[PDB]
Amino acid sequence: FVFGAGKPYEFSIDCDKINLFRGVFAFLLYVATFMYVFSTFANILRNK
Amino acid sequence: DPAKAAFDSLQASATEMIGYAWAMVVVIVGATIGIKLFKKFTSK
Amino acid sequence: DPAKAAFDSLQASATEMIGYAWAMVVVIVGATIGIKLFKKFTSKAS
Amino acid sequence: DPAKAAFDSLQASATEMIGYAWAMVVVIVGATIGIKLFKKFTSKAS
Amino acid sequence: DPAKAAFDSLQASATEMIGYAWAMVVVIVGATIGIKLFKKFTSK
Amino acid sequence: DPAKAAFDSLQASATEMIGYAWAMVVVIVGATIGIKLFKKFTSK
Amino acid sequence: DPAKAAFDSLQASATEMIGYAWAMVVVIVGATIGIKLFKKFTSKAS
Amino acid sequence: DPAKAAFDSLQASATEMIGYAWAMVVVIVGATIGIKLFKKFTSK
Amino acid sequence: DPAKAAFDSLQASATEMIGYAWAMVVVIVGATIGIKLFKKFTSKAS
Amino acid sequence: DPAKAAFDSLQASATEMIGYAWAMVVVIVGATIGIKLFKKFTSK
Amino acid sequence: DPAKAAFDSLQASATEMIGYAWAMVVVIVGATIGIKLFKKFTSKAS
């Protein structure tokens, strides 16, 4: 994303440090689904 | 009035910058609302 | 009184400058309040 | 007019310095915004 | 230009420091995300 | 007293501004309490 | 002692100014505390 | 010592103000703890 | 050496003033830390 | 070097103060973790 | 050139002072970062 196309004050939020966030974000979504599928099999007879 | 000319230039410049800012805030607020939805769907 | 006329001129010019200044503040203060409220409401919603 | 040439030289030099200055601001402001966003998103995720 | 030389030095120095900083932030953010996971696993 | 006159003017001006402010805060606090109710009704 | 009378006058004037100043602070500080408490309580309620 | 006299006055004044402050904080903290209890009793 | 005696006097006076100053800081810093901790603990409790 | 002597004194003083601070933080952090445990044990 | 020698001496002294200064910053900045991290981690844990 480019703030200030054409002007002396032109800067750009780069992708190299955003690609690292998407990496941690994937992980923290898999961990939070494994811990949901698991815990719903275990409590199948405990009427939730 | 050598001052009127100057004051007018600085207002013009300011208006331009507020425009660029209203853009940046919609990109960032988008992202924040998008992280908050996905996390919710995932955790009771 | 050479002085009286001169002091009068300076005050006149000063008043004009204050006018131009009030204009600029409104443009900047407007923007700042705008951005703040948008961010605040969005966060409270979700 | 010895003065005119001299005033002209000083303005020229000043313009050049403003150029070098704009460059430096972009490097620092870039970095600062970068670090902020990383920290913000990470916290919201978990 | 005795100013060009100086301005160039200070930019070089700044670039070096931003490099060291991008390192430190990944060590600290790592830790924070690691405390937040373990606490969750432990308390409903 | 050329100072008494001046000090009195500035107090008058201040009083006027506090009036306008007590208005703005009731419009914004209204909104905030209204977003917080609707979200609650919607999510357990 | 021309000086003594003059120093005395200046102190008198100064005391008066401090009086006018204390008045203004109370008006502004009152307002600021007022707005803060309203916002704080409202947020804690809901 | 024209300074000792002055320094002593300012300490005296400070002590008086801290007294008034310890009062105000107990009125406000009271209120805050009282809003937080009632809200809890009301919402699971 | 008229100067030596004079420089000596000034240092003596300065030392005394630093003494009075350290006293005042303790009174104010004490109060500030006090109020902060009370507010912090109260909020964490409920 | 009348400056070396001075700079050395100020570093010595600083080191002493950091020592006293590392003490105070362990007393306060203790308290905070102790209020947070007891409240938890009490409320689901 | 009496001036050249003198300007040279002043620069030498200045460089030395910057050295002593860098040392002090590291001691203070170290401490500050230390206290911050301890407080942050403790709060996140519980």
Curated annotation (Swiss-Prot), chain A:
Domain comment as written in the entry: Consists of 3 domains (N1/D1, N2/D2, and CT) separated by glycine-rich repeats and a C-terminal transmembrane segment. The N2 domain interacts with the F pilus, whereas the N1 domain forms a complex with the C-terminal domain of TolA at later stages of the infection process. The C-terminal domain is required for release of viral particles from the host bacterial membrane and proper integration of G3P and G6P proteins in the virion.
Gene this protein is translated from: III
Protein's recorded name: Attachment protein G3P
Highest taxon of the lineage: Viruses
Similarity remark: Belongs to the inovirus G3P protein family.
Compartments (UniProt record): Virion; Host membrane
Ranges annotated as spanning the membrane: 24-44
Function of the molecule: Plays essential roles both in the penetration of the viral genome into the bacterial host via pilus retraction and in the extrusion process. During the initial step of infection, G3P mediates adsorption of the phage to its primary receptor, the tip of host F-pilus. Attachment of the phage causes pilus retraction bringing the viral particle into close proximity of the host cell inner membrane.
Known partners and oligomeric status: Interacts with G6P; this interaction is required for proper integration of G3P and G6P into the virion. Interacts with G8P. Interacts with the tip of the host pilus. Interacts (via N-terminus) with host TolA. Interacts (via transmembrane domain) with host TolQ (via 2nd and 3rd transmembrane domains); this interaction allows the phage translocation across the host inner membrane. Interacts (via transmembrane domain) with host TolR (via transmembrane domain); this interaction allows the phage translocation across the host inner membrane.
Organism of derivation: Enterobacteria phage f1 (Bacteriophage f1)
Coiled-coil portions: none
Swiss-Prot record, chains B, E, F, H, J:
Record keyword Ribosomal protein present: no
A GO cellular component entry from the record: membrane
Statement: the UniProt record of this protein carries the keyword RNA-binding: no
Annotated protein name in UniProt: Capsid protein G8P
Subunit structure of this chain's protein: Homomultimerizes. There are several thousands of this protein in the phage capsid.
Highest taxon of source: Viruses
Chain ranges passing through the membrane: 18-38
Predominant location: virion
Membrane topology (Periplasmic): 1-17
Gene: VIII
Species in which this protein is naturally found: Enterobacteria phage f1 (Bacteriophage f1)
Keywords per UniProt: Capsid protein, Helical capsid protein, Host membrane, Membrane, Signal, Transmembrane, Transmembrane helix, Virion
Protein role: Self assembles to form a helical capsid wrapping up the viral genomic DNA. The capsid displays a filamentous structure with a length of 760-1950 nm and a width of 6-8 nm. The virion assembly and budding take place at the host inner membrane.
Subcellular locations according to the entry: Virion; Host membrane
Membrane topology summary: Single-pass type I membrane protein
